[PDB]
Amino acid sequence: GSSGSSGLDSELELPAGWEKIEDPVYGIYYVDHINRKTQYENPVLEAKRKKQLESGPSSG
Numbered sequence: 001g002s003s004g005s006s007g008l009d010s011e012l013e014l015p016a017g018w019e020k021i022e023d024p025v026y027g028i029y030y031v032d033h034i035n036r037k038t039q040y041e042n043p044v045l046e047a048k049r050k051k052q053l054e055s056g057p058s059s060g
Contacts, residue, residue, distance in 0.1 A: 012044040
């Protein structure tokens with residue numbers, strides 16, 4: 001695992017089923033009690049990042 005110096009990541013107004021767990025060794029990570037998944041990349045950012053998309057390649 002890669003330990004980052006700056007960690008300005010947080011819940012960021014998580015949607016639903018998100019829990020910000022702060023650990024001294026594991027660090028700050030969000031756990032989903034719905035998809036039993038845990039990752040560093042905040043969901044609020046991802047969704048709002050791939051959602052803000054106004055125009056893009058249409059496929060269907």
